[PDB]
Amino acid sequence: GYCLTRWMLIEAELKCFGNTAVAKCNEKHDEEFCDMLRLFDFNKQAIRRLKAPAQMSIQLINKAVNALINDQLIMKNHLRDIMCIPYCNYSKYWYLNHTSSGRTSLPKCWLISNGSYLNETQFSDDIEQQADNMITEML
Amino acid sequence: GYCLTRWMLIEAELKCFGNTAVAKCNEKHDEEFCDMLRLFDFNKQAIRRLKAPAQMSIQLINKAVNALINDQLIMKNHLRDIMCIPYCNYSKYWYLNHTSSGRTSLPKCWLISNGSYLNETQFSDDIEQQADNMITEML
Amino acid sequence: GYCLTRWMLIEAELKCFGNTAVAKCNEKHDEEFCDMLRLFDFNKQAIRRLKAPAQMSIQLINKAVNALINDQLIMKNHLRDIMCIPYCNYSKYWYLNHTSSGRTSLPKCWLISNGSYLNETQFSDDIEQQADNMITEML
Amino acid sequence: ELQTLELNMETLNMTMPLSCTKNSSHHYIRVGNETGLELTLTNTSIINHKFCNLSDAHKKNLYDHALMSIISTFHLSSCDFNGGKISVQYNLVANGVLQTFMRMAWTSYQYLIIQNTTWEDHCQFSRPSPIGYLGLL
Amino acid sequence: ELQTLELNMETLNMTMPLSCTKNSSHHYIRVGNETGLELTLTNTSIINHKFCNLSDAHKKNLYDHALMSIISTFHLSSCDFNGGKISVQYNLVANGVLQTFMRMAWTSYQYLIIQNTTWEDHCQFSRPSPIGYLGLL
Amino acid sequence: ELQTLELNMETLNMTMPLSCTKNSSHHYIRVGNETGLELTLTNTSIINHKFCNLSDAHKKNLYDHALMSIISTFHLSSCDFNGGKISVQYNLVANGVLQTFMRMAWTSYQYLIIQNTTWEDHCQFSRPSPIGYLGLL
Numbered sequence: 044g045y046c047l048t049r050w051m052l053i054e055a056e057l058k059c060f061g062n063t064a065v066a067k068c069n070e071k072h073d074e075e076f077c078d079m080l081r082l083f084d085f086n087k088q089a090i091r092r093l094k095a096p097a098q099m100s101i102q103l104i105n106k107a108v109n110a111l112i113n114d115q116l117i118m119k120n121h122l123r124d125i126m127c128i129p130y131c132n133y134s135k136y137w138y139l140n141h142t143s144s145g146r147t148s149l150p151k152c153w154l155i156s157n158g159s160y161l162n163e164t165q166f167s168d169d170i171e172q173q174a175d176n177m178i179t180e181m182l
Numbered sequence: 183g184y185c186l187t188r189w190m191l192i193e194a195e196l197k198c199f200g201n202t203a204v205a206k207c208n209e210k211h212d213e214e215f216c217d218m219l220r221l222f223d224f225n226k227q228a229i230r231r232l233k234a235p236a237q238m239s240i241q242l243i244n245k246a247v248n249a250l251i252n253d254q255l256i257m258k259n260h261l262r263d264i265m266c267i268p269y270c271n272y273s274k275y276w277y278l279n280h281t282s283s284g285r286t287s288l289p290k291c292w293l294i295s296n297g298s299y300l301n302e303t304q305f306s307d308d309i310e311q312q313a314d315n316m317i318t319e320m321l
Numbered sequence: 322g323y324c325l326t327r328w329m330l331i332e333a334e335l336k337c338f339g340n341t342a343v344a345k346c347n348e349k350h351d352e353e354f355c356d357m358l359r360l361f362d363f364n365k366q367a368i369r370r371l372k373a374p375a376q377m378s379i380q381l382i383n384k385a386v387n388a389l390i391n392d393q394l395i396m397k398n399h400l401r402d403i404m405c406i407p408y409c410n411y412s413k414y415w416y417l418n419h420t421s422s423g424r425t426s427l428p429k430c431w432l433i434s435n436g437s438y439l440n441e442t443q444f445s446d447d448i449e450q451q452a453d454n455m456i457t458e459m460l
Numbered sequence: 461e462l463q464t465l466e467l468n469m470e471t472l473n474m475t476m477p478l479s480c481t482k483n484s485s486h487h488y489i490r491v492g493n494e495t496g497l498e499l500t501l502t503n504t505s506i507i508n509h510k511f512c513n514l515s516d517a518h519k520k521n522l523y524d525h526a527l528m529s530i531i532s533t534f535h536l537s538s539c540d541f542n543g544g545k546i547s548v549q550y551n552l553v554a555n556g557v558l559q560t561f562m563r564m565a566w567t568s569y570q571y572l573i574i575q576n577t578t579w580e581d582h583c584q585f586s587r588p589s590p591i592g593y594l595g596l597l
Numbered sequence: 598e599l600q601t602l603e604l605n606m607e608t609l610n611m612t613m614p615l616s617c618t619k620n621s622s623h624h625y626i627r628v629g630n631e632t633g634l635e636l637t638l639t640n641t642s643i644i645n646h647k648f649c650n651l652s653d654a655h656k657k658n659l660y661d662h663a664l665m666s667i668i669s670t671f672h673l674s675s676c677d678f679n680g681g682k683i684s685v686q687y688n689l690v691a692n693g694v695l696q697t698f699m700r701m702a703w704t705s706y707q708y709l710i711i712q713n714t715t716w717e718d719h720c721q722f723s724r725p726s727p728i729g730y731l732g733l734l
Numbered sequence: 735e736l737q738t739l740e741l742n743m744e745t746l747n748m749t750m751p752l753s754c755t756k757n758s759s760h761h762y763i764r765v766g767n768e769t770g771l772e773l774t775l776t777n778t779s780i781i782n783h784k785f786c787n788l789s790d791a792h793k794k795n796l797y798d799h800a801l802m803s804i805i806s807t808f809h810l811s812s813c814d815f816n817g818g819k820i821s822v823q824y825n826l827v828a829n830g831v832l833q834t835f836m837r838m839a840w841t842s843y844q845y846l847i848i849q850n851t852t853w854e855d856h857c858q859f860s861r862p863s864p865i866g867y868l869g870l871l
């Protein structure tokens with residue numbers, strides 16, 4: 044199970060998920076979060092293997108962009124922002140944890156609009172839908 | 183459930199499907215119809231929110247193309263057309279309604295070749311396969 | 322069931338799979354093998370439906386590249402190569418056959434690193450996971 | 461049972477261009493409900509000078525961006541602009557221009573002309589559709 | 598139950614550029630832990646000559662590729678480099694430069710200035726994030 | 735039980751270029767069963783003039799389009815064409831040309847040479863494959 048450390052989290056120390064939840068990151072291509080995981084893995088591999096960089100590697104990241112991230116989703120978020128609809132900022136992610144057991148869910152990024160993180164009521168319906176998903180996951 | 187009005191259909195007035203059928207337009211990316219839905223949604227949002235278009239917004243559509251549609255499928259259809267195989271014209275679609283109950287299926291587009299719409303005899307295999315698909319979906 | 326001839330295999334004569342296994346080539350887009358099937362089918366169609374080429378067609382293949390193959394996966398393999406990780410060479414593929422019955426699996430390509438084909442000991446985890454996948458598929 | 465449906469693209473008359481053909485030598489592309497471009501095949505030359513100005517056209521600032529943005533995209537994938545009008549001539553390079561024109565519509569002709577016209581109910585059988593411009597773009 | 602998590606992008610300080618905003622007239626892009634570019638909205642002219650040489654800059658070979666690759670890709674999507682410094686200005690074309698600047702951050706101003714600076718804890722509220730450069734790239 | 739299969743790409747000898755490598759300084763790309771290009775690393779200069787005519791090459795119309803489309807896309811991502819032959823050399827810019835050459839194959843050398851040759855059973859251990867050209871396209 045992929046885990047997140049305290050150096051890549053704010054106000055958190057060790058908050059991490061199951062492998063079966065992260066398994067959705069190579070099947071569905073409408074998730075806003077898996078791009079961050081891919082960037083983190085690329086960063087770890089680059090700083091580990093390629094040693095002693097000579098003042099940054101601009102071409103390496105220029106070429107990894109075409110291979111790791113979803114440019115269509117980034118352009119979709121940009122178009123949504125310039126057209127004044129709640130969009131994504133790539134910094135806040137919400138999920139469910141089911142504290143009784145421990146099984147969790149893949150986060151969906153928060154909705155930002157007008158420079159204010161709109162509250163849980165304004166998208167609460169989505170919450171319920173995902174809950175139904177875990178209902179379908181109860182069996 | 184997404185419902186199509188009388189202004190976007192010819193010879194029809196109201197013809198629409200369950201939301202569970204439309205739910206396949208963000209999972210499977212081999213569908214020829216969902217691009218039209220995305221264009222209709224973009225058009226509605228553009229004419230609703232952005233007001234008083236000063237002689238069309240060319241850059242808005244030029245950048246929504248990169249974010250909403252599937253250029254690979256368009257080029258596949260163009261290659262089929264220039265290579266003399268039945269292709270799609272993005273104007274004719276066929277589906278199943280199951281008139282006893284009302285449960286329906288996502289339309290697949292018609293096959294146009296040599297400027298003539300080939301009839302149900304030349305692609306009955308797809309019809310049988312989709313009928314088997316709903317037969318499995320019955321359970 | 323798609324079948325491969327003796328002209329497109331080395332050391333083999335006839336070796337082919339169920340159509341149900343080939344069916345995964347239009348749903349999951351993380352498979353290294355389906356690109357070769359698309360290239361083979363395109364080659365057959367081009368040599369059949371177009372006769373007497375005027376010394377090879379360059380634009381037709383140039384445009385079929387954009388419509389048939391996965392450029393992101395190719396760039397991923399290239400980035401792995403330039404960064405000293407096992408990658409794919411597009412020439413060797415392994416699968417499971419279940420000789421007692423006959424049901425097979427979609428081949429996953431071999432991992433090439435340092436000019437040597439690493440053996441089954443260094444990726445036995447993938448073998449075990451896929452065997453578990455067919456075990457689940459047994460039901 | 462089996463049922464069919466046909467979509468009316470004229471609801472996209474704004475925010476997306478629509479194209480529909482009339483005869484094998486004529487094509488029409490439409491922006492808004494008043495202005496469009498004619499893509500015509502002919503044997504008669506309308507201009508003589510072999511100088512096409514496009515940077516001067518955009519620098520003029522007395523024009524319509526939507527009209528010649530499409531022709532700019534067509535150029536990327538001679539001319540005469542005096543007075544503010546739009547007129548682009550391709551004389552017959554032939555393979556590319558014919559391939560692009562056929563891409564829109566989805567020999568022994570001399571010239572292809574792009575010109576400004578007012579909307580009329582031109583196209584006889586082919587209903588308008590925006591797929592051509594989505595392909596060219 | 599619902600929980601929220603926020604990601605610290607400064608772990609990408611190497612191998613990825615980072616960007617964050619300070620005021621509506623100031624933006625910062627950062628490469629490594631010592632060098633970055635200031636993107637400043639201003640109504641003060643710094644250079645006069647109307648010639649930007651960029652090929653000579655790369656031919657100088659006394660520069661840093663990482664610093665000016667970003668300004669190169671910004672130009673793709675006047676200058677003064679004497680002495681090895683980096684200084685670019687765009688005077689007010691306005692729609693494109695403002696759109697690119699807003700793309701990074703994700704009027705009545707005459708100039709936008711790109712200049713070299715040393716890293717400081719500049720941006721107050723907006724945490725660094727690499728999405729802007731991934732969008733521009 | 736585990737089983738393995740190898741693919742023979744020579745059935746793609748038409749409609750797709752194939753390429754395979756022979757020695758760390760030689761590469762071969764094939765179009766058809768009669769013509770191909772040699773990519774050679776050498777310490778010997780073949781041409782002296784510093785002029786590479788390419789527009790006149792296509793304007794000549796006495797050539798093979800398929801042969802030099804590959805070199806055109808290589809240039810996009812000096813020369814001597816007198817008599818109809820094909821001969822291109824790159825001298826050591828070096829990083830880019832060597833990276834493209836390595837992209838085909840998937841130091842202290844002075845020149846990389848692209849030249850026309852007739853097909854022979856050249857490549858010793860590496861079987862032909864079209865993946866390199868798909869990647870560089």
Ligand SMILES: *[C@@H]1O[C@H](CO)[C@@H](O[C@@H]2O[C@H](CO)[C@@H](O)[C@H](O)[C@H]2NC(C)=O)[C@H](O)[C@H]1NC(C)=O
Nearest residue numbers: 481482483484485486487500501502503582584
């Ligand atoms: C298709 O329709 C056009 C439009 O009517 C025809 O163009 C006409 O051609 C005749 C003969 O040259 C001219 O006298 C008319 O002035 C043309 N019409 C217009 C509006 O300019 C064309 O001939 C028809 N057929 C083909 C094959 O293009």
Ligand SMILES: *[C@@H]1O[C@H](CO)[C@@H](O[C@@H]2O[C@H](CO)[C@@H](O)[C@H](O)[C@H]2NC(C)=O)[C@H](O)[C@H]1NC(C)=O
Nearest residue numbers: 495523524527542543544545546575576577578
């Ligand atoms: C296409 O656009 C051009 C540019 O506006 C038009 O040319 C002028 O249009 C105005 C508006 O009616 C006229 O007053 C001018 O006399 C036109 N100029 C010339 C030189 O005639 C052009 O008319 C438009 N096309 C059509 C068919 O109306």
Ligand SMILES: *[C@@H]1O[C@H](CO)[C@@H](O[C@@H]2O[C@H](CO)[C@@H](O)[C@H](O)[C@H]2NC(C)=O)[C@H](O)[C@H]1NC(C)=O
Nearest residue numbers: 618619620621622623624635637638639719721
């Ligand atoms: C945002 O912060 C910058 C940085 O402090 C402000 O720029 C200063 O502007 C004053 C003039 O009011 C100058 O005297 C300072 O020298 C500037 N600081 C610099 C250049 O580092 C800016 O005014 C602030 N507000 C806005 C809207 O940009």
Ligand SMILES: *[C@@H]1O[C@H](CO)[C@@H](O[C@@H]2O[C@H](CO)[C@@H](O)[C@H](O)[C@H]2NC(C)=O)[C@H](O)[C@H]1NC(C)=O
Nearest residue numbers: 622638639640641642688689704705706707708
């Ligand atoms: C830089 O120039 C702009 C104008 O392009 C200035 O904005 C004007 O500021 C004056 C202040 O008296 C206002 O009356 C105007 O309405 C503003 N707009 C225009 C279009 O003139 C801007 O203030 C200048 N920069 C500074 C620092 O003063």
Ligand SMILES: *[C@@H]1O[C@H](CO)[C@@H](O[C@@H]2O[C@H](CO)[C@@H](O)[C@H](O)[C@H]2NC(C)=O)[C@H](O)[C@H]1NC(C)=O
Nearest residue numbers: 632660664679680681682683712713714715716
């Ligand atoms: C941005 O980079 C340029 C190029 O190196 C710097 O300009 C020179 O930097 C060296 C090294 O500190 C100094 O010795 C020179 O005096 C600088 N040139 C001039 C004309 O002063 C520039 O200083 C850098 N920016 C910052 C804020 O340090």
Ligand SMILES: *[C@@H]1O[C@H](CO)[C@@H](O[C@@H]2O[C@H](CO)[C@@H](O)[C@H](O)[C@H]2NC(C)=O)[C@H](O)[C@H]1NC(C)=O
Nearest residue numbers: 755756757758759760761774775776777856858
């Ligand atoms: C790899 O093989 C090539 C081809 O045999 C060698 O290159 C030269 O090829 C010519 C024939 O075209 C011979 O006459 C030379 O003797 C070969 N060698 C040299 C140094 O010119 C090449 O040497 C071989 N080895 C390497 C490392 O490239």
Ligand SMILES: *[C@@H]1O[C@H](CO)[C@@H](O[C@@H]2O[C@H](CO)[C@@H](O)[C@H](O)[C@H]2NC(C)=O)[C@H](O)[C@H]1NC(C)=O
Nearest residue numbers: 758759775776777778779826841842843844845
């Ligand atoms: C091609 O010429 C270069 C000359 O630059 C040769 O490189 C030299 O190689 C020797 C021994 O390998 C070194 O001692 C020199 O320092 C190299 N010169 C450099 C790096 O400038 C190269 O070996 C030659 N290749 C062949 C096949 O003869």
Ligand SMILES: *[C@@H]1O[C@H](CO)[C@@H](O[C@@H]2O[C@H](CO)[C@@H](O)[C@H](O)[C@H]2NC(C)=O)[C@H](O)[C@H]1NC(C)=O
Nearest residue numbers: 769797798801816817818819820849850851852
């Ligand atoms: C590569 O192509 C060029 C262009 O056709 C060839 O050059 C001429 O080819 C013809 C056809 O055999 C000969 O009659 C001429 O004598 C060639 N020109 C010269 C100057 O020799 C070239 O021969 C081709 N390459 C090979 C290896 O055959």
Ligand SMILES: *[C@@H]1O[C@H](CO)[C@@H](O)[C@H](O)[C@H]1NC(C)=O
Nearest residue numbers: 057058059060140142145147
């Ligand atoms: C879910 O709750 C448990 C309770 O101890 C906690 O350990 C775990 O970290 C929580 N999950 C996440 C993703 O924070």
Ligand SMILES: *[C@@H]1O[C@H](CO)[C@@H](O)[C@H](O)[C@H]1NC(C)=O
Nearest residue numbers: 196197198199279281284286
């Ligand atoms: C299927 O038939 C029912 C019968 O009333 C009709 O209401 C419905 O609109 C039909 N489905 C479609 C998609 O038109």
Ligand SMILES: *[C@@H]1O[C@H](CO)[C@@H](O)[C@H](O)[C@H]1NC(C)=O
Nearest residue numbers: 335336337338418420423425
């Ligand atoms: C699996 O084994 C059977 C045994 O007869 C063989 O016929 C078949 O070809 C094998 N599968 C493949 C893909 O070769």
Ligand SMILES: *[C@@H]1O[C@H](CO)[C@@H](O)[C@H](O)[C@H]1NC(C)=O
Nearest residue numbers: 509510511512513514515516
């Ligand atoms: C623009 O028109 C002028 C006037 O004749 C002409 O001299 C010039 O060559 C033209 N420019 C282009 C690029 O065609």
Ligand SMILES: *[C@@H]1O[C@H](CO)[C@@H](O)[C@H](O)[C@H]1NC(C)=O
Nearest residue numbers: 507508509510538549551552
């Ligand atoms: C275009 O057509 C022919 C060239 O094939 C030539 O006679 C004519 O003058 C050309 N005119 C222009 C404006 O290019």
Ligand SMILES: *[C@@H]1O[C@H](CO)[C@@H](O)[C@H](O)[C@H]1NC(C)=O
Nearest residue numbers: 501502503504567568569570
């Ligand atoms: C145009 O001229 C060509 C001459 O090559 C001729 O073949 C063609 O028929 C002419 N077009 C018409 C409509 O007459």
Ligand SMILES: *[C@@H]1O[C@H](CO)[C@@H](O)[C@H](O)[C@H]1NC(C)=O
Nearest residue numbers: 644645646647648675688689
């Ligand atoms: C830039 O600003 C204005 C143009 O609007 C002009 O007065 C000034 O001289 C220009 N300077 C340069 C270097 O382009």
Ligand SMILES: *[C@@H]1O[C@H](CO)[C@@H](O)[C@H](O)[C@H]1NC(C)=O
Nearest residue numbers: 646647648649650651653676
């Ligand atoms: C560099 O820019 C200066 C600006 O005054 C100009 O005079 C000079 O010719 C330029 N050098 C070039 C373009 O090589």
